[PDB]
Amino acid sequence: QVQLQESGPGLVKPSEILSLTCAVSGGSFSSYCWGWIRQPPGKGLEWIGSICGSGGSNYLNPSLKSRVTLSVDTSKNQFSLILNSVTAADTAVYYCAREGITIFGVVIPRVLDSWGQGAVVTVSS
Amino acid sequence: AGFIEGGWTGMVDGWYGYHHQNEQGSGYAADQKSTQNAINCITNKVNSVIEKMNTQFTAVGKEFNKLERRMENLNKKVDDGFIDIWTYNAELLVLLENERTLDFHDSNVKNLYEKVKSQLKNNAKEIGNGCFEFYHKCNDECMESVKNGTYDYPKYSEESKLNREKI
Amino acid sequence: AGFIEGGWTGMVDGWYGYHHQNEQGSGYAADQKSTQNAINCITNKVNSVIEKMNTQFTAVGKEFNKLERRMENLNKKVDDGFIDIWTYNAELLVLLENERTLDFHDSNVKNLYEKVKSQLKNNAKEIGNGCFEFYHKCNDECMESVKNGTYDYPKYSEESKLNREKI
Amino acid sequence: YWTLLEPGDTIIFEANGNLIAPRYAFALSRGFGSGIINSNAPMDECDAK
Amino acid sequence: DIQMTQSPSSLSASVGDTVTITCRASQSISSWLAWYQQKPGKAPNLLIYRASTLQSGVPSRFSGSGSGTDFTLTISSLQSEDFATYFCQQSTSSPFTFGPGTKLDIK
Amino acid sequence: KPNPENGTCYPGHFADYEELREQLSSVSSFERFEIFPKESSWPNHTTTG
Ligand SMILES: *[C@@H]1O[C@H](CO)[C@@H](O[C@@H]2O[C@H](CO)[C@@H](O[C@@H]3O[C@H](CO)[C@@H](O)[C@H](O)[C@@H]3O)[C@H](O)[C@H]2NC(C)=O)[C@H](O)[C@H]1NC(C)=O
Ligand SMILES: *[C@@H]1O[C@H](CO)[C@@H](O)[C@H](O)[C@H]1NC(C)=O
Ligand SMILES: *[C@@H]1O[C@H](CO)[C@@H](O)[C@H](O)[C@H]1NC(C)=O
Ligand SMILES: *[C@@H]1O[C@H](CO)[C@@H](O)[C@H](O)[C@H]1NC(C)=O
């Protein structure tokens, strides 16, 4: 079982770089994809983007394609989210999770099993 | 980096995928629809090989005295016949199904190659190693439209013709 | 329409056919040669599975008393063995054949499509729905020659080239 | 020697000697299969089909 | 792209009852579905993958089935820990949208 | 066991060994009772063998 820990600033002004760093213990960036899930307060989940392998496969949401860039570095063993031009609608509870489930040697796309405990962030004055 | 050259190891998202090269970015990708069809198909085949088998409560071990030698010989004969038929059927079946699995996978690769070639008939030069080098320069929306299946000839026709004239 | 889009119900003459659109008239058609060859084959395949089964006068039910419990157990075991091997092999056989017959039909469709493309060459533009559209004006004789395989390319190459220059 | 009796049947023993009398009898139900096996392996409380 | 709907929106049941939750999809997604339950303020966990199989570490009381545009999840005995909300997810194409969510409550 | 240590206390032959083994290979309900009383049924016999 992998342990996921995420660190966030906890507060963000309008319209600058919003960056959170998620760290994993007991696992490596090998043969498992990694993705970001956010939920608005009282609304359903949605998928921002996913990285897989070590920078090889990058998948982004079509609505947030220009806004989010995913970066990885196996030597420090974290994956991070970079978000520019943050808005008030981006207030969410950021979850980082592992694409750990697999069938017949393929990693099923976007089916998540183990997540982090959550890092809250609000966009306000 | 072509299918005739070998197999990629970076991508694990699907069995089948595309590698895109662009000024904006460079990375791998995967065809969820093609892979999903194939994963479902292989799952159904394996389940049918294991599930169609239904065992019943049978006792194999039998005991006979010295007087009932014909019964012991008959039991040995029927057990040997059952195990020989089962071995032959299972081994020939699994060999044929392995060959079908490899053939079906190769056919999927060739179908994907012919689909992308029919979409890029003359807009992109064909290397022959499994690589389609675009004459016309186009960004990431162009390549994902090639993945989407919505690529159009007349939008980049004139630039491609000019690039043929240059080379 | 198109074969990737679906299957027509209007054509009852044969499993595979053509739809010609023209100013003087439009209607459905069938390629008898291909359909007829296919029927004889599956007729043999269906006949082979049913006919090869051979039978001899047989009594299955056997009766034994309490003092012959081992025998009745042996008879039950051997009957269960025959019915199990028969159901398993047959269920796998029908499944494999059903896949092959369906694939054979499509392989035939793909083989037919190419024959038309080769005969037409570049004179037409492939709409990609499985339909070829003629640049040159083509009367009923050249559609039936496409059906016949006797379509001649240099006769209409000039008109097709001029229509390529117009478009 | 042994024999099996259906319900509603009566067995009769008649002798003037050399008879080993049945002290106990066994009432049983019929299980169709599951023949005897021969092993020295340890027993375990797990269920395997 | 593939729009997701859920029914019923809200359901209430007691301990030991049988509850069926039917998430429905705009276009055929074949047999690919993910079911998640979310405790309030906690991380959601996987329940059902491929609409017919159980992920290890999940109690066997949960069961899922269905094909085509309609799917169901059936719970045999509903305990106290199973009263959290549930979600339905499709996995065939981008964007991988989620269900609106169905809340469970006591009586 | 492969070789039973206590197959029989007194030497002799068993009629229909394999038939009895197949009949007793599975019994769902098995009980032991007395077909005859040990001492009441035999007044004139010793029953002390
Ligand atoms: C049940 O089986 C056990 C294990 O075989 C028997 O215990 C022992 O069996 C052996 C084999 O017969 C006995 O050895 C014998 O000892 C006598 C002593 O004079 C010797 O003359 C023989 O040549 C043979 O070696 C051994 O005594 C015996 N142990 C005891 C009785 O404590 C056991 O007898 C069997 N019981 C029944 C009811 O069959
Ligand atoms: C991808 O294709 C679908 C269906 O053909 C279409 O609705 C969608 O707009 C396309 N996406 C892009 C970015 O063109
Ligand atoms: C059709 O083809 C056959 C054989 O090639 C030929 O004899 C016949 O004349 C053709 N029919 C027409 C109308 O050209
Ligand atoms: C025992 O012997 C007495 C005296 O001969 C006789 O009356 C009685 O019937 C005998 N009982 C049996 C069971 O033979």
Side-chain angles (χ1 to χ4, degrees), chain E residues 48-90:
Chain E
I48 301 299
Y49 73 110
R50 244 181 179 255
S52 298
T53 51
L54 287 160
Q55 189 273 330
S56 177
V58 176
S60 61
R61 49 178 186 261
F62 291 80
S63 59
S65 60
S67 181
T69 187
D70 273 18
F71 302 93
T72 57
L73 188 152
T74 306
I75 179 67
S76 64
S77 59
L78 192 173
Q79 276 75 246
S80 60
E81 70 269 13
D82 316 292
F83 271 105
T85 81
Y86 290 88
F87 288 91
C88 177
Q89 186 203 3
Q90 73 75 10

Short mmCIF file of all heavy atoms in Angstrom, two decimals, chain E residues 48-90:
data_model
loop_
_atom_site.label_atom_id
_atom_site.label_comp_id
_atom_site.label_asym_id
_atom_site.label_seq_id
_atom_site.Cartn_x
_atom_site.Cartn_y
_atom_site.Cartn_z
N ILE E 48 -16.18 -0.72 -7.34
CA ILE E 48 -16.43 -1.60 -8.47
C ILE E 48 -15.67 -1.06 -9.67
O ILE E 48 -15.75 0.13 -9.99
CB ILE E 48 -17.94 -1.69 -8.79
CG1 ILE E 48 -18.73 -2.22 -7.60
CG2 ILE E 48 -18.18 -2.59 -9.99
CD1 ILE E 48 -18.33 -3.60 -7.17
N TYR E 49 -14.92 -1.94 -10.34
CA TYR E 49 -14.28 -1.62 -11.60
C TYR E 49 -14.78 -2.56 -12.68
O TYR E 49 -14.98 -3.76 -12.44
CB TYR E 49 -12.75 -1.68 -11.49
CG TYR E 49 -12.14 -3.06 -11.40
CD1 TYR E 49 -11.40 -3.59 -12.45
CD2 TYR E 49 -12.30 -3.83 -10.25
CE1 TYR E 49 -10.83 -4.85 -12.36
CE2 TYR E 49 -11.73 -5.09 -10.15
CZ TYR E 49 -11.01 -5.60 -11.21
OH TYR E 49 -10.45 -6.85 -11.12
N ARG E 50 -15.01 -2.05 -13.91
CA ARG E 50 -15.53 -2.88 -15.04
C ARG E 50 -16.98 -3.30 -14.80
O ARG E 50 -17.43 -4.22 -15.51
CB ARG E 50 -14.61 -4.06 -15.36
CG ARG E 50 -13.97 -4.02 -16.74
CD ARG E 50 -13.11 -5.25 -16.90
NE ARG E 50 -12.46 -5.33 -18.19
CZ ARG E 50 -12.84 -6.14 -19.17
NH1 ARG E 50 -13.87 -6.95 -19.01
NH2 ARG E 50 -12.17 -6.14 -20.32
N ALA E 51 -17.69 -2.68 -13.83
CA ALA E 51 -19.11 -2.88 -13.57
C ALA E 51 -19.49 -4.29 -13.12
O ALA E 51 -20.68 -4.54 -12.88
CB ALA E 51 -19.98 -2.51 -14.78
N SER E 52 -18.55 -5.23 -13.01
CA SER E 52 -18.89 -6.59 -12.61
C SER E 52 -17.94 -7.21 -11.60
O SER E 52 -18.23 -8.31 -11.12
CB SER E 52 -18.96 -7.50 -13.85
OG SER E 52 -19.98 -7.08 -14.74
N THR E 53 -16.83 -6.56 -11.26
CA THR E 53 -15.78 -7.17 -10.46
C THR E 53 -15.55 -6.36 -9.19
O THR E 53 -15.87 -5.17 -9.12
CB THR E 53 -14.48 -7.27 -11.26
OG1 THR E 53 -14.18 -6.00 -11.84
CG2 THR E 53 -14.61 -8.31 -12.36
N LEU E 54 -14.97 -7.02 -8.19
CA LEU E 54 -14.74 -6.44 -6.87
C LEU E 54 -13.26 -6.19 -6.67
O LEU E 54 -12.44 -7.09 -6.88
CB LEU E 54 -15.26 -7.36 -5.77
CG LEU E 54 -16.78 -7.48 -5.58
CD1 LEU E 54 -17.12 -8.75 -4.82
CD2 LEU E 54 -17.29 -6.27 -4.83
N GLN E 55 -12.92 -4.97 -6.27
CA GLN E 55 -11.54 -4.64 -5.94
C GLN E 55 -11.21 -5.17 -4.55
O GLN E 55 -12.04 -5.12 -3.64
CB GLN E 55 -11.32 -3.13 -6.04
CG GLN E 55 -9.88 -2.65 -5.93
CD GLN E 55 -9.43 -2.42 -4.51
OE1 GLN E 55 -10.23 -2.08 -3.64
NE2 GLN E 55 -8.14 -2.60 -4.26
N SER E 56 -9.99 -5.69 -4.39
CA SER E 56 -9.62 -6.37 -3.16
C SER E 56 -9.50 -5.40 -1.99
O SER E 56 -9.00 -4.28 -2.14
CB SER E 56 -8.30 -7.12 -3.35
OG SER E 56 -7.89 -7.75 -2.15
N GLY E 57 -9.93 -5.84 -0.82
CA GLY E 57 -10.04 -4.97 0.34
C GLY E 57 -11.39 -4.33 0.52
O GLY E 57 -11.56 -3.52 1.44
N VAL E 58 -12.35 -4.65 -0.33
CA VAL E 58 -13.72 -4.16 -0.24
C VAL E 58 -14.60 -5.32 0.23
O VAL E 58 -14.39 -6.45 -0.23
CB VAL E 58 -14.22 -3.61 -1.59
CG1 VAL E 58 -15.68 -3.19 -1.53
CG2 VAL E 58 -13.34 -2.45 -2.03
N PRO E 59 -15.52 -5.10 1.16
CA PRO E 59 -16.41 -6.20 1.60
C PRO E 59 -17.25 -6.74 0.45
O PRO E 59 -17.65 -6.01 -0.46
CB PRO E 59 -17.28 -5.54 2.67
CG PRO E 59 -16.41 -4.46 3.22
CD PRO E 59 -15.64 -3.93 2.04
N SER E 60 -17.52 -8.05 0.52
CA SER E 60 -18.19 -8.74 -0.58
C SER E 60 -19.70 -8.50 -0.60
O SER E 60 -20.39 -9.06 -1.46
CB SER E 60 -17.90 -10.24 -0.51
OG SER E 60 -18.38 -10.79 0.70
N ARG E 61 -20.22 -7.71 0.34
CA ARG E 61 -21.65 -7.41 0.34
C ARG E 61 -22.03 -6.54 -0.86
O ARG E 61 -23.18 -6.60 -1.32
CB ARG E 61 -22.03 -6.71 1.65
CG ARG E 61 -21.13 -5.55 2.03
CD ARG E 61 -21.60 -4.88 3.30
NE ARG E 61 -20.84 -3.68 3.62
CZ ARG E 61 -19.85 -3.63 4.50
NH1 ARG E 61 -19.49 -4.73 5.15
NH2 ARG E 61 -19.21 -2.49 4.73
N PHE E 62 -21.10 -5.75 -1.36
CA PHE E 62 -21.36 -4.91 -2.53
C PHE E 62 -21.35 -5.75 -3.80
O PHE E 62 -20.54 -6.66 -3.96
CB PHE E 62 -20.34 -3.79 -2.64
CG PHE E 62 -20.46 -2.74 -1.56
CD1 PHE E 62 -19.94 -2.96 -0.30
CD2 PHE E 62 -21.09 -1.54 -1.83
CE1 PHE E 62 -20.05 -1.99 0.69
CE2 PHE E 62 -21.21 -0.57 -0.85
CZ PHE E 62 -20.69 -0.79 0.41
N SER E 63 -22.26 -5.43 -4.72
CA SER E 63 -22.35 -6.12 -5.99
C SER E 63 -22.80 -5.14 -7.07
O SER E 63 -23.69 -4.32 -6.84
CB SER E 63 -23.33 -7.30 -5.93
OG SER E 63 -24.62 -6.87 -5.56
N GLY E 64 -22.18 -5.24 -8.24
CA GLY E 64 -22.55 -4.41 -9.37
C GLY E 64 -22.76 -5.24 -10.62
O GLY E 64 -22.14 -6.29 -10.80
N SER E 65 -23.65 -4.75 -11.48
CA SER E 65 -23.98 -5.44 -12.72
C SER E 65 -24.57 -4.44 -13.69
O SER E 65 -24.88 -3.30 -13.34
CB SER E 65 -24.95 -6.60 -12.46
OG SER E 65 -26.16 -6.13 -11.88
N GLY E 66 -24.74 -4.88 -14.93
CA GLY E 66 -25.38 -4.09 -15.96
C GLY E 66 -24.50 -3.95 -17.20
O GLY E 66 -23.30 -4.18 -17.19
N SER E 67 -25.17 -3.55 -18.29
CA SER E 67 -24.50 -3.31 -19.56
C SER E 67 -25.35 -2.35 -20.37
O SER E 67 -26.53 -2.14 -20.08
CB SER E 67 -24.27 -4.61 -20.33
OG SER E 67 -23.60 -4.36 -21.55
N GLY E 68 -24.73 -1.76 -21.39
CA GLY E 68 -25.46 -0.83 -22.23
C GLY E 68 -25.53 0.56 -21.61
O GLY E 68 -24.55 1.06 -21.06
N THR E 69 -26.70 1.19 -21.73
CA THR E 69 -26.85 2.54 -21.21
C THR E 69 -27.26 2.55 -19.74
O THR E 69 -27.23 3.60 -19.09
CB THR E 69 -27.87 3.31 -22.05
OG1 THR E 69 -27.89 4.69 -21.64
CG2 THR E 69 -29.27 2.72 -21.87
N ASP E 70 -27.63 1.39 -19.20
CA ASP E 70 -28.16 1.29 -17.84
C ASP E 70 -27.28 0.37 -17.00
O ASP E 70 -26.85 -0.68 -17.48
CB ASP E 70 -29.60 0.79 -17.85
CG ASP E 70 -30.61 1.91 -18.00
OD1 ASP E 70 -30.21 3.01 -18.45
OD2 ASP E 70 -31.80 1.69 -17.68
N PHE E 71 -27.02 0.77 -15.76
CA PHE E 71 -26.22 -0.01 -14.83
C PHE E 71 -26.83 0.11 -13.44
O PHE E 71 -27.51 1.08 -13.11
CB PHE E 71 -24.77 0.46 -14.79
CG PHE E 71 -24.07 0.40 -16.11
CD1 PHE E 71 -24.03 1.51 -16.94
CD2 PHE E 71 -23.41 -0.75 -16.51
CE1 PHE E 71 -23.38 1.47 -18.15
CE2 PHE E 71 -22.75 -0.80 -17.72
CZ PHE E 71 -22.73 0.31 -18.54
N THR E 72 -26.57 -0.91 -12.61
CA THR E 72 -27.06 -0.94 -11.24
C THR E 72 -25.95 -1.38 -10.30
O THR E 72 -25.07 -2.16 -10.67
CB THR E 72 -28.26 -1.90 -11.07
OG1 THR E 72 -27.89 -3.21 -11.48
CG2 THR E 72 -29.47 -1.43 -11.87
N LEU E 73 -26.00 -0.86 -9.07
CA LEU E 73 -25.20 -1.36 -7.96
C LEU E 73 -26.15 -1.83 -6.87
O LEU E 73 -27.01 -1.06 -6.44
CB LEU E 73 -24.23 -0.29 -7.43
CG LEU E 73 -23.16 -0.64 -6.39
CD1 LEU E 73 -21.98 0.28 -6.53
CD2 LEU E 73 -23.67 -0.56 -4.95
N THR E 74 -25.97 -3.07 -6.42
CA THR E 74 -26.83 -3.66 -5.41
C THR E 74 -26.02 -3.94 -4.16
O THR E 74 -24.98 -4.61 -4.22
CB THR E 74 -27.48 -4.94 -5.92
OG1 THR E 74 -28.16 -4.68 -7.15
CG2 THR E 74 -28.48 -5.47 -4.90
N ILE E 75 -26.48 -3.44 -3.02
CA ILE E 75 -25.87 -3.70 -1.72
C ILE E 75 -26.82 -4.62 -0.95
O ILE E 75 -28.03 -4.39 -0.90
CB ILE E 75 -25.56 -2.40 -0.97
CG1 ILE E 75 -24.94 -2.70 0.40
CG2 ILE E 75 -26.78 -1.48 -0.87
CD1 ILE E 75 -23.57 -3.32 0.32
N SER E 76 -26.26 -5.70 -0.39
CA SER E 76 -27.10 -6.68 0.30
C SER E 76 -27.47 -6.19 1.69
O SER E 76 -28.65 -5.98 2.00
CB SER E 76 -26.38 -8.03 0.37
OG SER E 76 -25.20 -7.93 1.15
N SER E 77 -26.48 -6.01 2.56
CA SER E 77 -26.68 -5.50 3.91
C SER E 77 -25.96 -4.18 4.04
O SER E 77 -24.75 -4.10 3.80
CB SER E 77 -26.18 -6.49 4.96
OG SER E 77 -24.80 -6.76 4.79
N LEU E 78 -26.69 -3.13 4.42
CA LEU E 78 -26.16 -1.78 4.47
C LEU E 78 -25.90 -1.44 5.93
O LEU E 78 -26.84 -1.29 6.72
CB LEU E 78 -27.13 -0.81 3.80
CG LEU E 78 -26.85 0.66 3.42
CD1 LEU E 78 -28.04 1.18 2.62
CD2 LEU E 78 -26.60 1.59 4.58
N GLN E 79 -24.62 -1.33 6.30
CA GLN E 79 -24.24 -1.01 7.66
C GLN E 79 -24.06 0.49 7.84
O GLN E 79 -24.39 1.30 6.97
CB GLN E 79 -22.95 -1.75 8.04
CG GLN E 79 -23.17 -3.18 8.53
CD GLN E 79 -23.49 -4.13 7.39
OE1 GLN E 79 -24.59 -4.68 7.32
NE2 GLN E 79 -22.53 -4.34 6.50
N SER E 80 -23.51 0.87 9.00
CA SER E 80 -23.37 2.28 9.33
C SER E 80 -22.31 2.96 8.48
O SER E 80 -22.44 4.14 8.12
CB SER E 80 -23.03 2.44 10.82
OG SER E 80 -21.82 1.78 11.14
N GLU E 81 -21.25 2.23 8.12
CA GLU E 81 -20.16 2.83 7.36
C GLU E 81 -20.53 3.03 5.90
O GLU E 81 -19.86 3.77 5.17
CB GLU E 81 -18.90 1.97 7.47
CG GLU E 81 -18.99 0.64 6.74
CD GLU E 81 -19.52 -0.48 7.61
OE1 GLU E 81 -20.06 -0.19 8.70
OE2 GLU E 81 -19.40 -1.66 7.20
N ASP E 82 -21.61 2.39 5.45
CA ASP E 82 -22.02 2.48 4.05
C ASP E 82 -23.02 3.59 3.79
O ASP E 82 -23.60 3.64 2.70
CB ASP E 82 -22.59 1.14 3.59
CG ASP E 82 -21.76 -0.04 4.06
OD1 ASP E 82 -20.62 -0.19 3.57
OD2 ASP E 82 -22.24 -0.81 4.91
N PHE E 83 -23.24 4.49 4.76
CA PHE E 83 -24.24 5.53 4.59
C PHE E 83 -23.70 6.75 3.86
O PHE E 83 -24.44 7.72 3.66
CB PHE E 83 -24.80 5.95 5.95
CG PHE E 83 -25.99 5.15 6.40
CD1 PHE E 83 -25.86 4.19 7.39
CD2 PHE E 83 -27.23 5.36 5.82
CE1 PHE E 83 -26.96 3.45 7.79
CE2 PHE E 83 -28.33 4.63 6.22
CZ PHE E 83 -28.19 3.67 7.21
N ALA E 84 -22.44 6.74 3.45
CA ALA E 84 -21.86 7.88 2.76
C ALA E 84 -22.39 7.96 1.32
O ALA E 84 -23.07 7.07 0.83
CB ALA E 84 -20.34 7.79 2.76
N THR E 85 -22.05 9.07 0.66
CA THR E 85 -22.49 9.29 -0.71
C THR E 85 -21.75 8.36 -1.67
O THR E 85 -20.70 7.81 -1.34
CB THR E 85 -22.26 10.74 -1.12
OG1 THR E 85 -20.89 10.92 -1.49
CG2 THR E 85 -22.59 11.68 0.03
N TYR E 86 -22.32 8.19 -2.86
CA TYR E 86 -21.75 7.32 -3.88
C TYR E 86 -21.63 8.08 -5.20
O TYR E 86 -22.35 9.04 -5.45
CB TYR E 86 -22.60 6.06 -4.08
CG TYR E 86 -22.54 5.10 -2.92
CD1 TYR E 86 -23.41 5.22 -1.85
CD2 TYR E 86 -21.60 4.08 -2.89
CE1 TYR E 86 -23.36 4.34 -0.78
CE2 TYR E 86 -21.54 3.19 -1.83
CZ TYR E 86 -22.42 3.33 -0.78
OH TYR E 86 -22.36 2.45 0.28
N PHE E 87 -20.70 7.62 -6.04
CA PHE E 87 -20.43 8.27 -7.32
C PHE E 87 -20.31 7.24 -8.43
O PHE E 87 -19.96 6.08 -8.20
CB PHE E 87 -19.14 9.11 -7.26
CG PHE E 87 -19.27 10.37 -6.45
CD1 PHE E 87 -18.98 10.37 -5.10
CD2 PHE E 87 -19.70 11.54 -7.05
CE1 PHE E 87 -19.10 11.53 -4.36
CE2 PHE E 87 -19.82 12.70 -6.32
CZ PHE E 87 -19.52 12.70 -4.97
N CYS E 88 -20.60 7.69 -9.65
CA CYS E 88 -20.50 6.88 -10.86
C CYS E 88 -19.56 7.56 -11.83
O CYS E 88 -19.68 8.77 -12.07
CB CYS E 88 -21.89 6.68 -11.49
SG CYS E 88 -21.89 5.76 -13.05
N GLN E 89 -18.62 6.81 -12.39
CA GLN E 89 -17.61 7.35 -13.29
C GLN E 89 -17.50 6.49 -14.54
O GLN E 89 -17.52 5.26 -14.46
CB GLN E 89 -16.25 7.45 -12.60
CG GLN E 89 -15.18 8.15 -13.43
CD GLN E 89 -13.77 7.76 -13.03
OE1 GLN E 89 -13.57 6.92 -12.16
NE2 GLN E 89 -12.79 8.38 -13.67
N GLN E 90 -17.36 7.15 -15.69
CA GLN E 90 -17.09 6.49 -16.96
C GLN E 90 -15.61 6.64 -17.28
O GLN E 90 -14.98 7.62 -16.87
CB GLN E 90 -18.01 7.06 -18.06
CG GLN E 90 -17.75 8.49 -18.63
CD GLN E 90 -16.57 8.63 -19.59
OE1 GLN E 90 -15.98 7.64 -20.04
NE2 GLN E 90 -16.22 9.87 -19.91
#
